[PDB]
């Protein structure tokens, strides 16, 4: 059986791992058009703040290691096209120019996403940077110590935007963050969490310019101004972190795509064409909070999907169990995490929800180590089933979001969580811990 896997990032890497322990026998070929196998873009923040010195160590596999295992790795080799009927791909060696056609029995593709750019006048004067992959990591690092860079503008206040904003603010620059939405991180967190994080960011001289539409970049040769409908901001560097678009235009006509470019797949990772599976940022995933499919471009999703595509390689035998959209991040002193439905997700999906927010010290009164924690529990008004949660504190309480993710998946209710057995010891929590306390509040509100 010869299996060709496209992509060395998180979806293609786990497909090779599951092929190694489920079909040890197979002939596996692993292709990467880039020069570096399995660079972890997720570690970009740790590197930019100097926690990690070596950019080449921010990775989880090397080609040499996979080759010890019998996989054939082809870096600097691009898959140009798929011929689904004749079970062939045409590959181009990017260092010599040599094209060749390679045959396969099964193809798993994890082509990923690419940074979306604003296509406006000024579109590319120099020093308008993107944030994905090794090369942009190195270039962004160089600008961190550049004495000529004083004003940084980042466009987009979602996860990548707020990570570029914190790394440049910590390096000493003046940062302005621009978004069309009205709250930084609104996609992930609700108003009661983002009001506290706006304060923290402004305390570290980050200006949040929300509710603004960038119209053009101005400058001679390199960027100098970012002008929006309401304002112009001086900029020596712009980082554009406005979201991701699927890397699938080369597949138009070959595989069925949704209108937005995402690949159509079913719950066994099968595409519209026999023997080719698709995984990762370029696909939709079963979203259990709302029993629908959603694009949730996260590494955890891509890794799980990549393994489930190998499970259904020969027979659709194992449907994907679905995910709740869990994500977390530290912004300056705050460590937060959310899962399931928040206000922006419920609006998008037309889901009506109820919520309680509890803000109080997570340790008992006499304990001097006590700090505030914010916990919001979102539930269904009819069944009172758990639909999502958001938590934040300067203490790390984020592993608790993992218990809520299981509670959404098992369809538990506010009453289940009000009395669920979570340990008490006064150096770690209160006798009704953070999940128990918010669920007890929801029970009273529905009494
Ligand atoms: C700054 C940053 C921080 C992030 N942090 C986190 C985090 O902490 N937690 C989290 O869960 N997620 C995080 N993510 C998201 C996560 O990195 C992605 O969800 C995940 O990498 C997507 O996996 P993928 O395999 O679908 O695609 P991609 O990572 O986009 O990888 C696509 C790969 O396939 C290769 N390829 C594409 N086309 C071809 C071709 N035709 N021929 C050959 N090779 C090809 C590409 O060169 C690339 O190597 C972050 C992303 C970024 C940019
Ligand atoms: N901690 C994590 O798990 C982690 C960290 C970084 C990235 N990732 C994932 O990688 C993906 C890409 O991250 P991202 O930060 O690029 O996207 P994102 O979706 O998190 O946020 C994009 C932001 O851009 C804003 N925006 C859109 N168009 C705009 C415009 N024209 N002008 C101004 N603002 C605009 C959006 O409103 C949103 O706030 C996401 O799926 C993200 O969740 C996750």
């Amino acid at each position: 059986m010869k299996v060709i896997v496209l992509g060395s990032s998180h979806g293609g890497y786990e497909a090779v791992e599951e092929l190694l322990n489920l079909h040890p026998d197979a002939e596996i070929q692993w292709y990467e058009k880039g020069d570096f196998i399995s660079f972890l873009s997720c570690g970009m923040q740790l590197y930019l703040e100097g926690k990690v010195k070596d950019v080449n160590s921010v990775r989880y596999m090397t080609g040499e290691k996979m080759e010890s295992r019998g996989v054939n790795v082809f870096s600097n080799t691009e898959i140009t096209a798929i011929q689904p009927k004749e079970h062939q791909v045409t590959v181009k060696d990017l260092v010599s120019g040599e094209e060749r056609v390679e045959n396969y029995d099964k193809l798993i593709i994890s082509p990923g996403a690419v940074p979306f750019e604003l296509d406006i006048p000024g579109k590319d004067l120099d020093n308008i940077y993107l944030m994905r992959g090794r090369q942009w990591a190195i270039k962004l690092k160089q600008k961190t110590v550049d004495p000529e860079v004083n004003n940084v503008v980042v466009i987009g206040s979602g996860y990548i935007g707020i990570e570029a904003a914190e790394a440049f603010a910590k390096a000493g620059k003046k940062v302005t963050v621009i978004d069309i939405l009205d709250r930084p991180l609104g996609v992930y967190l609700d108003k009661e969490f983002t009001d506290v994080l706006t304060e923290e960011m402004e305390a570290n001289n980050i200006t949040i310019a929300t509710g603004e539409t960038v119209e053009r970049y101005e400058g001679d040769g390199r960027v100098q101004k970012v002008v929006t409908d309401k304002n112009a901001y001086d900029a020596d560097l712009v980082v554009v972190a406005v979201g991701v678009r699927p890397n699938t235009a080369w597949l138009k006509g070959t595989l069925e795509l949704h209108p937005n470019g995402l690949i159509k797949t079913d719950e066994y990772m099968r595409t519209s064409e026999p023997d080719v599976f698709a995984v990762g940022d370029a696909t939709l995933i079963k979203y259990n909070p709302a029993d629908t499919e959603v694009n949730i471009a996260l590494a955890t999703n891509a890794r799980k999907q990549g393994r489930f595509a190998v499970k259904n390689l020969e027979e659709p035998v194992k449907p994907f169990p679905g995910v709740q959209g869990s994500s977390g991040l530290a912004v300056f002193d705050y460590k937060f995490a959310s899962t399931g439905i928040n206000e922006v997700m419920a609006q998008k999906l037309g889901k009506e929800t109820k919520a309680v927010t509890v803000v109080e010290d997570y340790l008992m009164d006499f304990n001097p180590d006590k700090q505030k924690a914010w916990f919001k529990l979102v539930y269904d008004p009819e069944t009172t089933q758990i639909l999502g949660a958001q938590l934040m504190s300067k203490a790390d309480l984020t592993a608790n979001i993992n218990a809520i993710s299981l509670a959404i998946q098992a369809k538990m209710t506010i009453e289940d969580l009000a009395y669920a057995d979570f340990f008490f010891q006064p150096a770690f929590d209160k006798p009704w811990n953070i999940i128990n306390t918010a669920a007890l509040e929801a029970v009273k509100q529905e009494r």
Side-chain angles (χ1 to χ4, degrees):
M1 177 177 42
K2 182 179 169 179
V3 189
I4 288 184
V5 181
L6 179 161
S8 70
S9 190
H10 292 276
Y13 168 63
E14 288 295 347
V16 174
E17 285 292 349
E18 192 86 312
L19 287 156
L20 249 8
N21 59 222
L22 293 184
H23 298 106
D25 46 86
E27 170 183 358
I28 298 143
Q29 294 195 343
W30 189 23
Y31 285 82
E32 171 55 60
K33 58 172 176 200
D35 184 38
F36 194 88
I37 297 308
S38 307
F39 179 72
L40 183 83
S41 282
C42 316
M44 201 160 304
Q45 183 176 55
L46 281 180
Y47 168 67
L48 293 188
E49 289 178 11
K51 244 277 175 59
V52 185
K53 266 75 188 64
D54 187 0
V55 72
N56 302 326
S57 68
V58 183
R59 63 143 103 212
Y60 42 88
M61 184 48 48
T62 68
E64 182 190 334
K65 196 80 161 184
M66 269 309 181
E67 298 209 300
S68 323
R69 298 214 264 170
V71 178
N72 302 109
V73 185
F74 297 88
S75 39
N76 298 298
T77 306
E78 186 186 0
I79 283 177
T80 279
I82 302 165
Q83 275 90 238
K85 280 173 184 53
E86 11 301 280
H87 287 233
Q88 302 175 319
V89 287
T90 131
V91 311
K92 194 178 178 193
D93 190 333
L94 256 37
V95 317
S96 51
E98 295 299 273
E99 244 158 87
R100 78 191 184 264
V101 167
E102 196 79 34
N103 289 318
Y104 59 86
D105 294 324
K106 303 286 170 164
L107 172 64
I108 303 171
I109 53 163
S110 199
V114 123
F116 181 118
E117 294 178 55
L118 260 33
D119 179 18
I120 57 181
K123 212 226 296 140
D124 240 280
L125 296 166
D126 305 271
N127 305 134
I128 291 173
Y129 287 4
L130 278 8
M131 190 160 153
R132 180 180 276 251
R134 254 243 305 172
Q135 301 306 331
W136 284 118
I138 295 179
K139 294 196 189 79
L140 252 9
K141 187 62 164 174
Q142 309 307 81
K143 295 274 157 171
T144 243
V145 298
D146 187 327
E148 317 248 87
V149 173
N150 291 295
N151 300 296
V152 170
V153 178
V154 340
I155 302 162
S157 70
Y159 279 150
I160 293 178
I162 294 300
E163 295 177 350
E166 178 180 303
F168 277 93
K170 286 178 175 184
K173 322 299 192 175
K174 266 44 206 50
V175 188
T176 302
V177 182
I178 301 170
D179 211 317
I180 56 189
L181 291 199
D182 62 300
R183 293 178 300 108
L185 291 168
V187 164
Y188 305 99
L189 263 11
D190 290 357
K191 206 188 186 278
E192 38 286 273
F193 296 77
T194 62
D195 286 344
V196 178
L197 292 171
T198 298
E199 282 192 75
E200 186 75 343
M201 289 186 302
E202 281 181 348
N204 291 76
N205 51 255
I206 289 182
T207 296
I208 287 95
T210 48
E212 282 183 41
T213 301
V214 181
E215 299 187 340
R216 84 195 80 108
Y217 304 114
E218 271 166 28
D220 206 317
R222 38 57 170 290
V223 71
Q224 273 152 5
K225 280 277 196 188
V226 171
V227 0
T228 67
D229 60 322
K230 319 282 188 177
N231 230 310
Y233 300 93
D234 294 317
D236 304 309
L237 220 235
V238 179
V239 182
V240 183
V242 120
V244 110
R245 69 175 131 91
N247 175 233
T248 53
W250 63 289
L251 290 168
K252 231 195 297 292
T254 309
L255 299 181
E256 268 170 65
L257 308 178
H258 289 276
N260 60 13
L262 253 33
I263 301 176
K264 294 207 210 307
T265 54
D266 57 31
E267 60 285 354
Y268 308 96
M269 310 302 120
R270 286 138 133 203
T271 63
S272 67
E273 282 284 345
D275 298 331
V276 356
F277 303 73
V279 126
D281 280 6
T283 71
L284 285 295
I285 195 163
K286 188 182 184 318
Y287 184 53
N288 299 141
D291 247 289
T292 187
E293 321 285 294
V294 186
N295 183 44
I296 296 170
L298 293 173
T300 41
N301 296 352
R303 283 179 86 127
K304 283 172 188 89
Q305 282 179 312
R307 294 203 167 190
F308 266 83
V310 173
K311 289 175 176 294
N312 301 128
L313 210 59
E314 307 183 294
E315 282 194 64
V317 118
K318 207 93 200 58
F320 191 69
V323 295
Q324 292 59 258
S326 306
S327 56
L329 190 65
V331 165
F332 286 113
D333 307 323
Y334 286 94
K335 294 165 205 62
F336 69 76
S338 50
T339 194
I341 286 163
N342 52 29
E343 197 198 50
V344 162
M345 254 302 206
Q347 282 182 71
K348 205 179 78 67
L349 305 167
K351 236 293 169 190
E352 198 44 76
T353 60
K354 278 223 196 181
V356 292
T357 307
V358 177
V359 193
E360 59 177 40
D361 290 323
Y362 82 97
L363 289 184
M364 290 178 86
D365 229 335
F366 60 87
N367 186 327
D369 298 340
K370 60 185 192 287
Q371 307 186 83
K372 297 270 285 294
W374 285 257
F375 190 86
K376 189 177 181 154
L377 189 67
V378 176
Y379 58 96
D380 193 300
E382 295 188 68
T383 56
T384 72
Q385 274 168 192
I386 305 311
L387 292 182
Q390 291 150 65
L391 75 79
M392 183 173 72
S393 188
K394 285 178 183 173
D396 185 359
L397 301 164
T398 62
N400 284 299
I401 214 59
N402 298 157
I404 301 299
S405 175
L406 297 183
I408 294 170
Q409 194 186 351
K411 305 275 196 184
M412 294 179 156
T413 66
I414 56 175
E415 183 161 52
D416 291 306
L417 290 199
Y419 307 99
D421 174 42
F422 301 134
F423 84 94
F424 167 58
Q425 207 288 324
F428 301 83
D429 53 6
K430 276 153 74 162
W432 294 101
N433 88 350
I434 218 184
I435 299 165
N436 288 148
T437 303
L440 261 330
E441 274 304 309
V443 167
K444 291 183 211 297
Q445 171 180 104
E446 298 304 296
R447 221 55 163 171

